[PDB]
């Protein structure tokens, strides 16, 4: 029912690692500062995502057992989770409490960023759905670790080796849900269900980027490796 010493150690270690991320307030201030053109917004997106992927590699390498995995499987896990991890992190940032009216302004600024309307609604539907779950920092950090260590990813040669790394994290998350949300026993299943919605954004990320209302879609060599873009 309660966490074991090994589990508390693992949880705290995932937490230290996750807290190395850029401050949510730092991100929201850049957006809420002034209304930018779609071109200035796309540039912010590419800068944010470049730093996100760099921080994600460092968090990923600290995941227990990750360094023991085959080098090609390591690349496949990272390439398959980078997009999902940024969307998951964007939902966390979105749902952080701000002074009255600022969350309405942040929503409107994102809606007017340059992204197509066809992608706006499923994006806000996912953020809204995440916010309803009232997730703690521990839950976001574990769910990010679980997303990275998904054996059910394409191009994985040794699925068993990855499943062995994902199981203890699934075990910790399941325990946290039974403790912080005892009135809702379906909470862990709800969280796991969100990961299927995450996968849809990954399937449409290239079209989302190319449909952005800018004259030129300029990327960095690192973003070309993580996104399916030229």
């Amino acid at each position: 029912m309660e966490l074991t010493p090994d589990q508390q150690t693992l949880l705290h270690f995932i937490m230290d690692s996750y807290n190395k991320q850029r401050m949510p307030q730092e991100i929201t201030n850049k957006i809420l500062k002034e209304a930018f053109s779609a071109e200035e917004n796309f540039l912010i997106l590419t800068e944010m995502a470049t730093n996100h992927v760099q921080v994600l590699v460092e968090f990923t390498k600290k995941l227990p057992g990750f360094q023991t995995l085959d080098h090609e499987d390591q690349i496949a896990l990272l390439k398959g989770s980078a997009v999902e991890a940024m969307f998951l992190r964007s939902a966390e940032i979105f749902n952080k409490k701000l002074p009255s009216g600022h969350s309405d302004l942040l929503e409107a600024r994102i809606r007017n960023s340059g992204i197509s309307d066809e992608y706006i609604t499923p994006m806000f539907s996912f953020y809204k759905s995440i916010g309803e779950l009232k997730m703690t920092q521990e839950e976001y950090a574990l769910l990010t670790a679980i997303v990275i260590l998904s054996p059910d990813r394409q191009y994985i040669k040794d699925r068993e080796a990855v499943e062995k790394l994902q199981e203890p994290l699934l075990d910790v998350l399941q325990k946290l849900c039974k403790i912080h949300q005892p009135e809702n026993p379906q909470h862990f299943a709800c969280l796991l269900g969100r990961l299927t919605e995450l996968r849809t954004f990954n399937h449409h990320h290239a079209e989302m980027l190319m449909s952005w209302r800018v004259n030129d879609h300029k990327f960095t060599p690192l973003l070309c490796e993580i996104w399916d873009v030229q």
Binding site: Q54, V57, H71, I75, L78, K79, P221, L222, I226
Partner: peptide, 12 residues
């Protein structure tokens, strides 16, 4: 090819 990812994952 994933030269940069390969680099970020192998260095210390």
């Amino acid at each position: 090819d994933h030269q940069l990812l390969r680099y970020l994952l192998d260095k210390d």
